[PDB]
């Protein structure tokens, strides 16, 4: 998962 | 396209079901500007997935739930003067414009992304959004003060220039933390005597790079 998220 | 939008409506329903999207304004904005309109073609098939996606220059467009969370905290009203720091794809700026119904200012430090965002906005027919090239950790003096400043990249500390550019009663929404990719989502309200900080919890954002960000 890529960084923006919670 | 019809397929992409149907997948998007499912995403919106999920966010409402999870209690992430809770206001009519934010739901309307999301339905008007789906995320697939702001990503490169090769990523449009993932636009509905609730996580961030890549965009040019090594950056990303935030996950739908995160954008919703931040917009709901912003509690945007028609006419507000908003500054977004970290334009990226231009998605969030488009959503903001749909709610405030007036000029929106958003700043991006990467030239390639400034053009990327402008293209996405023009293609989607957005008119009130102005994409600025510069270091947003310094805010944007030309149109200050702002009702709300939304920062979409993580800082090592609260940028003083951003507090100074807030209208009294205004708010700064920004990920702040001791790590480049792990922060606390802070809501900073400007008062007549100083500020009020509300910690909304852990989040993960790409680093804010600049004079008052990570150097
Ligand atoms: N100081 C800054 N000013 C403006 N945009 C920035 C700054 N630091 C990071 N960004 C941008 O934040 C965007 C967040 O999606 C990225 O496109 C990134 O380049
Ligand atoms: Cl400019
Ligand atoms: Na990002």
> Within 10 A of B4 (CB to CB), how many other CB atoms are there?
15
Catalytic pick among B23, B38, B62, B89: B62
Active site residue B89: no
CA B118 to chain CA mean position, Å: 15
CB of B136 sitting under 6 A from ligand 1 = yes
Give the residue, out of B95, B150, B151, B153, with the most ligand 1 atoms within 8 A of its beta carbon, to mutate for a pocket test: B153
The 3-class secondary structure across B164-183, one letter per residue, is HCEEEEEEEEEEECCCCCCE
> Within 10 A of B159 (CB to CB), how many other CB atoms are there?
26
Question: What are the domain boundaries of chain B?
Answer: 1-215
Are A5 and B152 an interchain contact pair (Cβ–Cβ within 8 Å)?
A: no
Backbone angles phi, psi at B8, to 5 degrees: -65, -45
Helix (H, G, I), strand (E, B) or coil at B152: coil
Are B63 and A4 an interchain contact pair (Cβ–Cβ within 8 Å)?
A: yes
Query: Which architecture does CATH list for B1-215?
Result: 3-Layer(aba) Sandwich (3.40)
Decide if A6 contacts B51 (C-beta within 8 A): no
Beta bridge partners of residue B197, listed in sequence order: B188
Length of chain A: 6
Decide if B135 contacts B112 (C-beta within 8 A): no
Helix (H, G, I), strand (E, B) or coil at B3: helix
Question: Where does chain B have alpha helices with state H?
Answer: 2-17, 24-32, 64-74, 91-100, 111-123, 160-164
Helix (H, G, I), strand (E, B) or coil at B133: strand
Helix axes B2-17, B24-32, angle to 10 degrees: 160
Solving technique for this entry?
A: X-ray
Helix (H, G, I), strand (E, B) or coil at B46: helix
């Amino acid at each position: 998962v890529y960084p923006x998220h919670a | 396209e019809k397929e992409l939008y149907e997948k998007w409506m499912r995403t919106v329903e999920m966010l409402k079901a999870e209690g992430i999207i809770r206001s009519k304004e934010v739901e309307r904005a999301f339905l008007k500007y789906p995320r697939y309109l702001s990503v490169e073609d090769k990523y449009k098939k993932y636009a509905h997935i609730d996580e961030p996606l890549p965009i040019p220059a090594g950056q990303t467009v935030s996950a739908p739930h995160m954008v919703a969370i931040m917009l709901e905290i912003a509690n945007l009203k028609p006419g507000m003067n908003i500054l977004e720091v970290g334009t990226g794809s231009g998605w969030n700026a488009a959503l903001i414009s749909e709610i405030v119904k007036t000029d929106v200012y958003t700043i991006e430090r990467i030239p390639e992304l400034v053009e990327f965002a402008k293209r996405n906005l023009e293609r989607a027919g957005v008119k009130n959004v102005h994409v600025i090239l510069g270091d947003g950790s310094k805010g944007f003096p030309p149109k200050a003060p702002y009702d709300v400043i939304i920062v979409t990249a993580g800082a090592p500390k609260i940028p003083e220039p951003l507090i100074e550019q807030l209208k009294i009663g205004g708010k700064l929404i920004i990920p702040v933390g001791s790590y480049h990719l792990w922060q606390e989502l802070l809501e900073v309200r400007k008062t007549k005597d100083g500020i009020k900080i509300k910690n909304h919890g852990g989040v993960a954002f790409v680093p804010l790079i600049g004079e008052y960000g990570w150097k």
